[PDB]
Symmetry: D4
Subunit: 160 residues, 8 copies
C-alpha cells in the first residue's frame, strides 16, 4: 500500500531512535516509508523530498535529527504537510541542542516537536496516527484500542 | 459554525500568548473555541473537556501553559485527538520550565510541542490548520495561499 | 495497620528510586501503601486516588515521576493533603526536566519538592515523618532518635 | 495567639517575595511570625532560632533565600520540624541558583521546596496550612473553602 | 565594487544585530551586500543564493539567525565558501537556542560561529576581514591598523 | 607541625575528590588537617570548627561539598579566615548544583570557588599555598619551583 | 601608600561592577590600584602587569571580566600571587558564560572565583582583605569590626 | 612543505579530539603543524607562537581547549590571522564550559567556533580548507571533490 507517512533521518545512526516510530506505524497498520535524508549533506534531496511529499500522497512527515538539528524545520519550510520532529540524543549535550534546534521555530513555519530520544520517536508515530485517525475510521478504532489497552495494562503495584 | 479546534489555557494571563493562536485560526476561517481550563485549579473541568472533545466534534486541541505546565499532557491523557502544546514564557525561567514540562512526554501519550511564547501559539494554529487541511480542500487552498504570501512577502533587503 | 502515607509512581522503573521512600517509612514504623498510578496512562485512576485519599485516612502523599513529571502536581490538584514530589532521574536530561516539571507549580496548588533521585525519595519519607510527628508523639520520639543517631554517626576523619 | 508557623528570610529585599507567604497565612488565620534570619550574616541567630523552634511551639518553618541559598537547609539541620524552602529570584540567574541550592539536599535532612518567587512563597504557606490542617479541624475546613473558591473562581473564557 | 562578502539574515528584526557586521565591513572598505534570506520562509531563495555565491564572486558569507537558527547551516550545505554564523539574541532563551542551533554542526559541513548578539556580528565581519586579508595586502594593512588602534585605545584606568 | 590549612568535607565519598588537595599540600610541605564535617548532619560540629579555626592557628580552610553544597558558605559565615570552596561532582547534575551553591554567595561573606571536581581540589590547595606564600619565604620559593617546573614540563608536540 | 591589591578589568563598562571592590578596599583602608587591562585587546599589557605584580609589591589581584572571560585565568598564568576572579554579568547569558570561563580552570593554575556581579566584586575585596589580614594585625582588627557590624546590623523583622 | 595551518592544543589528552583536524588536513593535502601550547601553563610560549605565526607563513590557526578554554581567544589576541576554536568535551559539564569560554568573545577579537568534540575538530579543518581554497585553485578543486563525494555517498535508506 502507498505510504501516507514519511519517516526521515540524516544518518544510519539516527535509526536506533527512529526505528521506534517505524515499529509503531507498522503496529497500527499505517503504510509508510523510511528514508535517509541529510539536511546538511543532501540539501537538494531534502528540497525535492519535501516539495513533492504531498503530491506523492504523504500526509505526515516525521523527521529526526540531532545536534544542530535542521532536518525537521527545513522539511517544514518546503511542505504544507504537518511535520513532526524528533530530537535525537546527542553525545555531549544529551539532546538539549537537538531539542532547541527543532522546537524553537519562529512563527510561520511549525514543527510539532516530541521528546528527546526513543520516547519522542514512538510519540511522533502516535501523533501521526491521531492525525490520520481524524479521516480514517478504521485507524481511529485501532488507535482507540491501542490507547485503551495501554491504560488497562498498567499494573496496580510495583514489585520489590 | 461548530468548533473543530479547541484552544485552552490555564489562566487569563496566558491569553496574551494564546491570542495569537486564536487570531490565526480566525484569519484562516477555522471555527474554534477559546477557553480557560486550569489543570491545577480545575482538574475535573479538564477531565470533562478532554474526554468529551471528540464526541463534540473537535479535531485538534491547542493547549498553553507555563511553569510546571501540565495542561497539554493531561489533556492528551484523556483524548485520542492530537494535542498541540504551547509553552508560555514564565517570569523566572523564561519558559524553559514550560518547555521541558510539555515536550518531555513519555512514550504512549504524545503532545506536539511548539516554540516558547507567541511564535509557538501562532505555529500551533498553523499546525492545526495543516492537519485539518488533509481532509478539507477549501482550507487546504487557504493554507497554501497563507504560506505562499508569507514566502512572497519577505523583503530582499533590510531597511535602516 | 491502615496506611497514613501513600507512595505513588507511574511505572515499575520508578520503583528503583521510590523504594528508598518505602524503606524509610518502614524503618520509622509508618504504615503506608505503595502503588503504581500513571498520570498519563491512568488519569482516571489518579483522579480517584487523589480525590479519595483523605477519606481513606491518608495524611501525606509522596509522588515520584520523571521527564514531563505531572503525577505530583495533578495529585495535588485533587487532594487537600500535602503532596511531596520526587523527581526521578531521566535518561537524557538527568532529571532537570523532572525537577522543573514538579517544583515550578503556580501559586495555589503546592507540591513540596525534594532532590532528584534516591536522596529525594529518602527525604520525602523523612519530610512525611516530620509532618506526622507533629501529632504523633511516639513517632516524634522515633524521628528524634533517628536524627540524633544520624548526627552521632558521622565520622571525624576520612580514610585514605 | 502564639505562632505555629515561622517565616524567615535572609534580608529585607527577600520580603518582596516572602510577603506573599505572610499574607496567605493571615488570610487563613494561621498565627505566625515573620522574621529576618541570615544564614551567612547571622549564623548563630539561625542556630538558636532553629534549635528552639519546636520548644517554642512552632510546627512548620518557611524559609526563603536567594543565590547560594543556604537558609532553608541549615534550618532543617537544626530542627526536627518540617522546613519548606522558597527560592528567591536572583538578579543574574533568575533563581536557578536559589532553586538548586535549596532542593538538592542529600538524604537525611529534607527541605520541601516550592517554586521560584512569589508563587513559591504563596505555595509554601498553603503547604504549611495543609500540614496543620491534618490536626486542626477548623483550619482544615477553612483550607477546603480556600481550595473550593480557587477552583470555582476560574473563568470559563478569556477576556480581550 | 562587486561584493566579496554577503551578509544575510532571516528578517528585518535581525538587522538590529547584523547592522554591526555591515558597519564594520564598510569601515574596512570591504565591498559587500546585505540581504534578507529566510531559511524557513524563503528556502528556495536560500538555495539559489548559496549555490551561486561563489560564481558571483563572493568569498565569505556571514549569516545571522535566531531561535531555531538554520540559516547559517543550510547556507553552508549549499556553498563551498566559508560560512560564519551569528546567533541572534532570542526573546525567551536569550540566544542559547540560536547558539546551539548554529554551532553544533555535525562533521562535514562547517559554520564558524561567533558570539551571541552584536559582538558576534562585529566579530563575524572582523573574521571575514582576516580571511580576505590573507590574499589582499592593502586590506591586510588596514586590518593591522584596525587591530593596532583597538589595542592602543584601551584606557589605563576607569572613569568614575 | 601544627596545621595551618584545614581541609573539610561532608562525607567519606567526598574524599575521592578532596584527596587531591591533601596530596598537593603535602607535596608543598604545608602542614594541614583533613576532617569530615557535615553542614547538614553535624551543624554544631561545623559551627565549633569554623568559630575556633583562627585561634587554633589555621590560616586557610578548604571545604568541599556536593549537591546543595552548604559547607563552604557556612564555614565562611563563622570564620574570618579565607575559605576556599571545592564543588564536588554530583551524580545527576554533574556538579552544576554544587558549583552554584558554593560560588553564588551574596555580598558580605566570600567563598573563593574553584573548578568542579579534582581540578578544583588541586587548585584550592595551590591557591591556599599562594596565600601562605605571601608571608612564608621558604614556601614561596617551593611554590615558585613548582610553577616553573609545571611550565617547563609541558611537551612541545602530541603523540599519535 | 604603595598598592598591595590590584583590581583589573577589561573595559570601562566592567567598572560598574568592579567599583564595588574598589569601594570596599577603600572602606577597609587597603592601598590598591584600579586599572583597565584587557586580555583580548591588550594581551602584552596583561603579560607585563601580571609578570611584575609581585616585584612591585602587590599581594593579591582581583580581576573582573565578562563573556569569554579570560582575564583572571591569564593573569594567574603569569603570577604566583593569588588571583581572585569576578564574573561580570553579560547581556545575553547573564554571566553564566563569565562564570564558567573563570571558575573551570584546570589543575595547576588557580583562580578563586566569586559570585556573578556586584556581590562577587564586593566579596573579592573582602576575600583579599581576609588574606592580607593573616599577616597585618591592624587590618585583621578592622576586618573583625567589619564582619561584626555586618552581623549586628541585620534587622530582626522586615519592614512593610 | 612549509606549514600553512597550525593546530594547537593544551595537552596530550586534547589530541584525542584534535587528531580529527590533523587527519582531515592531511586528507586534503594541506601542510600543517600540530603542537602543544598551554594557555595557562605556557603563556609565553603561546604569546610567541601567536605573535610570530603570520611571519612564519601560517594562514589559519586551529586551537582546541576544554573547561576554562582560553587558548583560542588568547591566540586571537596576538595574531591577525583567522583563529578557529574547537571546544573539547569536559568531564563534568560535557563541553558547555568549553563552548561558552570560546564562542562568547567580545566584539573586536574573533574566534570562529565549531561544535563540541570530534565533529568540531573535523569541521575546523574543513573551514580552514575553505578559507585556503579562496586563493589556492588546486585545493579548491580537492575540496569540491570532497564535498561532492560526501553528498553522493549518503545512503537512501537505513538498515534494520
Amino acid at each position: 500500500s502507498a505510504p501516507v507517512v514519511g519517516i526521515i533521518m540524516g544518518s544510519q545512526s539516527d535509526f536506533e531512535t527512529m526505528r521506534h516510530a517505524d515499529a509503531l506505524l507498522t503496529e497500527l497498520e499505517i503504510p509508510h516509508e523510511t528514508l535517509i535524508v541529510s539536511a546538511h549533506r543532501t540539501p537538494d534531496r531534502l528540497a525535492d523530498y519535501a516539495r513533492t511529499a504531498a503530491e506523492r500522497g504523504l500526509n505526515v512527515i516525521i523527521a529526526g535529527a540531532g545536534g544542530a538539528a535542521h532536518l525537521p524545520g527545513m522539511c517544514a519550510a518546503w511542505t504544507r504537510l504537518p511535520v513532526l520532529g524528533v530530537p535525537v540524543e546527542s553525545r555531549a549535550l544529551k539532546g538539549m541542542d537537538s531539542l532547541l534546534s527543532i522546537v524553537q521555530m519562529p512563527g510561520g513555519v511549525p514543527v510539532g516537536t516530541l521528546a528527546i530520544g526513543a520516547s519522542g520517536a514512538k510519540n511522533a508515530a502516535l501523533l501521526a496516527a491521531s492525525i490520520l485517525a481524524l479521516f480514517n475510521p478504521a485507524l481511529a478504532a485501532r488507535l482507540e484500542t491501542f490507547r485503551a489497552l495501554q491504560t488497562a495494562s498498567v499494573p496496580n503495584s510495583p514489585i520489590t
